[PDB]
Amino acid sequence: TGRPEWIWLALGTALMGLGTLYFLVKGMGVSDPDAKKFYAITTLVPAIAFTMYLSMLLGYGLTMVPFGGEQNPIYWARYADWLFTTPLLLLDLALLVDADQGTILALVGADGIMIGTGLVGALTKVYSYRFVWWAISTAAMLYILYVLFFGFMRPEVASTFKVLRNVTVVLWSAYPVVWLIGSEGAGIVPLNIETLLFMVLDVSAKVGFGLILLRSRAIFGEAE
Amino acid sequence: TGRPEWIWLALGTALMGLGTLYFLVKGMGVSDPDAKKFYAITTLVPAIAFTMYLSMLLGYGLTMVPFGGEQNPIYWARYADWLFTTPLLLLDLALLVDADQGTILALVGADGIMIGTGLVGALTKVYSYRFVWWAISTAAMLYILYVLFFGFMRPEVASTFKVLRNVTVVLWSAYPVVWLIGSEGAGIVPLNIETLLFMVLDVSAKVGFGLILLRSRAIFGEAE
Amino acid sequence: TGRPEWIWLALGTALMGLGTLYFLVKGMGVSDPDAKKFYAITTLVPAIAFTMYLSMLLGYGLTMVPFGGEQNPIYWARYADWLFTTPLLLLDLALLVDADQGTILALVGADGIMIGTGLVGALTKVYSYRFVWWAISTAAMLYILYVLFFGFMRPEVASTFKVLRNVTVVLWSAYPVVWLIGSEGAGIVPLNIETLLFMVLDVSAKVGFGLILLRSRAIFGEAE
Ligand SMILES: *C/C=C(C)/C=C/C=C(C)/C=C/C1=C(C)CCCC1(C)C
Ligand SMILES: *C/C=C(C)/C=C/C=C(C)/C=C/C1=C(C)CCCC1(C)C
Numbered sequence: 001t002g003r004p005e006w007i008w009l010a011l012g013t014a015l016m017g018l019g020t021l022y023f024l025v026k027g028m029g030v031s032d033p034d035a036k037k038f039y040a041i042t043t044l045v046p047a048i049a050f051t052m053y054l055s056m057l058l059g060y061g062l063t064m065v066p067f068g069g070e071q072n073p074i075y076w077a078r079y080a081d082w083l084f085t086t087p088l089l090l091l092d093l094a095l096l097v098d099a100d101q102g103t104i105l106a107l108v109g110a111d112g113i114m115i116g117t118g119l120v121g122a123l124t125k126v127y128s129y130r131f132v133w134w135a136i137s138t139a140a141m142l143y144i145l146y147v148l149f150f151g152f153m154r155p156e157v158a159s160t161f162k163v164l165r166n167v168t169v170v171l172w173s174a175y176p177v178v179w180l181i182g183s184e185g186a187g188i189v190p191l192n193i194e195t196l197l198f199m200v201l202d203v204s205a206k207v208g209f210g211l212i213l214l215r216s217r218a219i220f221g222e223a224e
Numbered sequence: 225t226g227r228p229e230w231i232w233l234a235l236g237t238a239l240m241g242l243g244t245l246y247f248l249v250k251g252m253g254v255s256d257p258d259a260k261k262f263y264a265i266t267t268l269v270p271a272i273a274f275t276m277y278l279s280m281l282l283g284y285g286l287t288m289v290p291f292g293g294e295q296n297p298i299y300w301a302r303y304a305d306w307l308f309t310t311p312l313l314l315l316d317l318a319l320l321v322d323a324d325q326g327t328i329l330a331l332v333g334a335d336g337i338m339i340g341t342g343l344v345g346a347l348t349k350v351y352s353y354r355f356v357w358w359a360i361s362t363a364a365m366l367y368i369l370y371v372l373f374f375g376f377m378r379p380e381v382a383s384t385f386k387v388l389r390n391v392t393v394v395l396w397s398a399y400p401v402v403w404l405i406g407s408e409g410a411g412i413v414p415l416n417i418e419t420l421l422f423m424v425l426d427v428s429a430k431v432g433f434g435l436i437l438l439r440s441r442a443i444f445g446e447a448e
Numbered sequence: 449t450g451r452p453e454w455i456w457l458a459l460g461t462a463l464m465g466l467g468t469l470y471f472l473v474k475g476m477g478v479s480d481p482d483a484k485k486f487y488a489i490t491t492l493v494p495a496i497a498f499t500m501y502l503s504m505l506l507g508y509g510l511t512m513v514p515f516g517g518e519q520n521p522i523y524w525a526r527y528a529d530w531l532f533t534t535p536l537l538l539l540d541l542a543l544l545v546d547a548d549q550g551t552i553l554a555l556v557g558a559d560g561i562m563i564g565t566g567l568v569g570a571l572t573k574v575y576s577y578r579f580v581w582w583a584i585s586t587a588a589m590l591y592i593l594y595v596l597f598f599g600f601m602r603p604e605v606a607s608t609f610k611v612l613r614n615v616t617v618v619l620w621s622a623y624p625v626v627w628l629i630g631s632e633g634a635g636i637v638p639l640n641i642e643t644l645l646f647m648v649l650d651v652s653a654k655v656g657f658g659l660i661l662l663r664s665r666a667i668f669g670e671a672e
């Protein structure tokens with residue numbers, strides 16, 4: 001199309017699609033029940049992202065929100081993606097460490113709150129209030145990060161969890177910043193650059209994260 | 225009303241309602257925990273369908289989508305039904321065979337993708353792109369069917385699973401065809417006939433499927 | 449704002465926010481896995497309510513629905529809250545009594561139906577039909593109440609469950625009445641009083657319920 005961000009949406013669609021196919025093929029033949037869980041979660045994540053990238057590319061997942069006296073292009077489909085994919089990603093971490101159910105519920109619920117309030121902020125027509133939602137969403141993210149560090153095994157489990165926790169902190173923490181400087185927030189970075197940034201983050205957080213996880217012996221039960 | 229498809233919506237509402245009441249009464253008194261799971265899942269399915277049929281009958285679950293240069297009546301409430309009822313139905317099959325959690329997640333997630341992309345296709349304003357969504361949704365359905373045949377007990381469990389798997393393949397595979405030839409897709413069959421077809425499919429896939437399942441000794445633990 | 453109900457929305461936001469913070473601090477340090485489940489569920493409930501109260505206060509969670517020949521202010525965000533918080537509350541009760549999974553699914557599903565049909569009724573443009581949805585929603589509520597009394601331990605578990613079941617029946621049963629007499633239904637009580645009533649009910653059903661639950665020894669495994 002003639003939205004300059006189309007190229008990043010197209011590459012995102014492609015990389016999510018290819019990552020989905022790769023993980024699908026890779027998990028073919030896996031019989032270990034524990035490993036199956038990780039393959040399922042980890043393949044579902046970019047498959048969902050693929051659909052939502054495509055919806056943005058085709059224009060379905062874009063709406064105009066009036067605020068600051070303009071009609072502002074907001075890609076709402078990102079939140080529909082994140083609503084499902086972010087708890088899934090947290091579930092991969094939580095299963096790695098054999099987290100308590102209470103802890104999993106805390107994580108999933110805080111994540112739901114993070115995404116839902118981010119969506120509310122994204123669609124809010126009173127400019128100043130958009131940042132209230134951003135702050136609440138960010139608080140939920142900080143709670144999530146706190147639990148990953150202070151709320152929790154085989155040495156390979158510890159090692160893989162540590163690496164993935166670090167990837168998670170670094171990549172996830174960038175999202176509120178991009179939103180804040182981008183078209184959803186202060187509008188200091190144009191939508192095409194914002195789209196590029198989220199594409200790099202998303203591909204790393206999904207396909208990159210998944211490559212790290214699915215390469216590890218941590219996803220298998222200890223078997224002779 | 226004066227929408228000619230009202231009669232099929234009314235009969236669908238009635239048959240789902242009656243099926244719900246029948247399963248409710250039938251599962252009264254069931255104490256076996258395994259059987260309770262099947263009664264719960266299986267009664268919930270037509271209860272949800274009853275609500276969404278009624279919403280279509282009353283006109284709430286209908287919207288107009290512009291495409292191909294017309295205002296096209298799209299019953300969106302079907303997807304709200306299917307979003308919940310189709311994974312529930314898959315859950316009945318998966319519990320019958322004591323499926324791995326990874327496999328259940330794969331099934332539920334692929335199903336979510338099937339329904340969500342079908343909804344996107346149903347609401348998409350660019351005619352040609354509607355069929356892209358249809359294709360992606362169909363791929364998700366084919367993945368689901370593949371898992372039911374290649375991804376998986378007491379002989380009565382095997383026997384009941386086999387029958388229900390066959391019912392599932394035959395009925396579910398008809399949905400993409402009806403959508404394709406109907407008002408959502410190529411518009412070769414009118415909405416009133418499309419509605420009739422989905423009504424027959426839905427009642428069979430829910431109340432018919434449920435009668436088969438709930439009549440079986442497979443839903444009970446092996447007890448003396 | 450100049451909506452007279454703003455004061456009740458503001459106090460609701462505050463009390464849910466404070467209740468969230470209190471439960472969060474209170475559950476700090478809890479290591480018992482069973483207790484963690486209850487703290488997680490019970491803190492998530494007012495955290496979600498806090499977000500949805502704030503959304504109503506800020507005006508995001510309000511829409512106008514034409515019916516009875518007027519444009520009627522309907523707070524839809526209540527349903528988005530209840531959709532998540534009501535099954536969570538039922539989950540607290542069900543975990544207390546170690547409910548069968550079938551029973552939990554029945555409860556959660558009936559609750560989903562209660563809330564979804566209440567939302568449909570709230571948004572329905574044909575006045576008389578709003579009450580059809582109300583009736584169906586009420587039937588789902590009555591099913592839920594029936595299960596809590598007829599569908600189900602350590603003496604402290606029994607004692608706490610009994611108290612919380614009674615609180616639940618009394619408070620939950622008031623909701624259909626308020627809706628019926630309020631702006632969503634017959635319009636005999638003005639929106640500002642309706643808002644006050646739901647605020648008192650919600651705070652009691654969430655923060656009050658939670659204080660009772662989290663003060664009990666019932667939420668802990670039996671340990672030496
Ligand atoms: C695969 C995609 C992922 C891992 C996306 C993660 C996204 C977030 C952590 C987003 C966080 C946000 C906030 C913390 C504040 C408001 C804006 C959001 C939703 C971008
Ligand atoms: C009770 C209702 C059920 C079992 C409905 C099943 C529906 C489907 C399998 C629908 C599939 C579709 C596609 C595969 C492609 C696009 C259109 C859909 C959603 C009708």
Ligand SMILES: *C/C=C(C)/C=C/C=C(C)/C=C/C1=C(C)CCCC1(C)C
Pocket residue numbers: 530533534537562563565566567569581582583585586589620621623624627650653654
């Ligand atoms: C924390 C909030 C809670 C516990 C809310 C409970 C709400 C209900 C039990 C609402 C019930 C309703 C009906 C039974 C009929 C239609 C209207 C509703 C949704 C208010």
